[PDB]
Paper text:
To further elucidate how adjacent amino acids contributed to the conformation of the xylosyl group (Xyl) and regulated the regioselectivity of AmAT7-3, we analyzed the complex structure of AmAT7-3/astragaloside IV. In addition to the established critical role of H166, ten amino acids within 5 Å from the substrate were found to participate in building the internal structure of the active cavity. These amino acids include K407, R38, D311, A312, A310, L290, I34, I288, I374, and A376, which may play a decisive role in determining the substrate conformation. Unlike other acetyltransferases, the amino acids composing the β10 barrel (AADAG) in AmAT7-3 were relatively small in size, resulting in a larger active pocket to accommodate the saponin molecules such as astragaloside IV. Due to the relatively spacious pocket of AmAT7-3, we observed significant rotational motion of the xylosyl sugar ring throughout the MD simulation. Based on the rotation angles, we segregated the substrate into two major conformations using a 75-degree threshold. In conformation-1, the O3′ and O4′ sites formed hydrogen bonds with K407 and H166, respectively. This H-bonding constrained the substrate, positioning the O3′ site in close proximity to Cx, implying a potential site for selective acetylation. Our calculations showed that the reaction was initiated by the proton transfer from sugar O atom to His166, which was coupled to the nucleophilic attack of sugar O onto the acyl Cx, leading to the formation of a tetrahedral intermediate.
Here we report a saponin acetyltransferase from Astragalus membranaceus. AmAT7-3 is discovered through a stepwise gene mining approach and characterized as the xylose C3′/C4′-O-acetyltransferse of astragaloside IV. AmAT7-3 is a rare multi-site acetyltransferase which acetylate large saponin molecules. We solved the crystal structures of AmAT7-3 and its variant A310G in complex with astragaloside IV, respectively.
Author numbering: 1 to 16, 23 to 215, 221 to 251, 253 to 443
Write the structure that this text describes.
Amino acid sequence: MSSLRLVSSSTIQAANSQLIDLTVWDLIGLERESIQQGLLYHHPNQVDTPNQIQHLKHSLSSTLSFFPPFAGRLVITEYEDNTATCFIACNNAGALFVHAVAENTTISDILQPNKYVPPIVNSLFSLNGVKNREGTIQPLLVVQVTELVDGIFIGLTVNHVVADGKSFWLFVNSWAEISRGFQKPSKLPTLERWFLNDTDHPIRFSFSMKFQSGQLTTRFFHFTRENIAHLKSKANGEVTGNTERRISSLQALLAHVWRSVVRCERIDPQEVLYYILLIDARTRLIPPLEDDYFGNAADAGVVIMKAGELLEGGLGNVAWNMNKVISLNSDEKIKNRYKSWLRTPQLPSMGMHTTFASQLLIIANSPRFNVYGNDFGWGKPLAVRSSAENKRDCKIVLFAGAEEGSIDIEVCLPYEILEALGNDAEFLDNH
Ligand SMILES: CC(C)(O)[C@H]1CC[C@](C)([C@H]2[C@H](O)C[C@@]3(C)[C@@H]4C[C@H](O[C@@H]5O[C@H](CO)[C@@H](O)[C@H](O)[C@H]5O)[C@H]5C(C)(C)[C@@H](O[C@@H]6OC[C@@H](O)[C@H](O)[C@H]6O)CC[C@@]56C[C@@]46CC[C@]23C)O1
């Protein structure tokens, strides 16, 4: 029968102290979860596995020289007036490398296609359930490499106060480059983080003070470039006054997914619905941040619509509203939101009490991030998976698909809704 065991855990320091102040975007995650995403590889031929594991360890240490935050620790100071400060010490305490073996477990055991994510996937990551504020002691980066019968899985656990999704995949891209033989990564990080005024740091903040919580399931759906292009043309074709085809491919897809979920759940048309986009500030500040600004740089944009209007008003109207919410995340709004946060620096609560699955839907990650170029020397990955640790939030996570211009979405919802989506011919997914 199949089994899973850890064979070794090793501290990995940078191959070759500095302090980093954290801004509002970074602090907001202190009480929340890590980023856990990983890559599946098939080994067509035999591989010298001990040498492969050693090569991943040494290239990881080399990459860490260029990303010192991932080898450091958080420093939190708690004060008597119920406030706190936090920063990153690049003290080279080290990341963690975990070597696991999944005896008699295969690629296809992990990647049940058109099926739900199997429970084994969650055990391909280490430090599940650890909040980002525990980075004062816990490594900010854990890599778990799990040997399979016909390949390996490379699963990263990354502290979400240090990095967002963009910065996560910057590190993965650069590590694969170093592993392939590059001497430097092709994109170097910008480590200095953004504050409206140099006097703002260290920010003194306060900690603290769901429908089907603990019972959600996770399933992938694949969207071809053609089906996406169909959705974009339809959405722009429905909103003509005042358009030169400004609704984007992703806006139309997300509008379609929103409509499909709500249609499958069958809810009262008077329900108010909240759709949570994460809008990058890097390109929207004036002056803009560096493209490879390393840290968090995104703010929620909340799309609010009645269920009746969402469905009866047509795809283009939903996508146009999302477009407009995105367009309101201007340089003015970003800086004023920052300033009012400094005036009431409380870390958020996870929000309202939800009574159905479509009520509050969070949209995470991006199809812009480079998933399939992560060749460490043995070929491109077959797939990307997350830990699927989250069983509380109704959530859609966006991934680049294997074929050019396609998108995989990882959907966390009640089981019967995922079943309805898989049986819905209006859901334009494939395979
Ligand atoms: C009246 C309105 C306008 O309809 C109201 C009704 C209520 C709501 C629906 C809005 C609130 O208004 C504000 C709101 C968005 C919350 C506060 C957070 O949002 C941040 O709030 C702070 C202020 O506290 C702002 O300064 C930031 O700009 C903003 O982004 C966010 C994040 C950043 C933690 C977000 O995190 C991702 O989790 C998943 C990971 O996979 C990702 O990687 C990671 O990012 C999860 C959702 C979540 C918890 C919630 C939930 C929804 C809320 C509760 O809208």
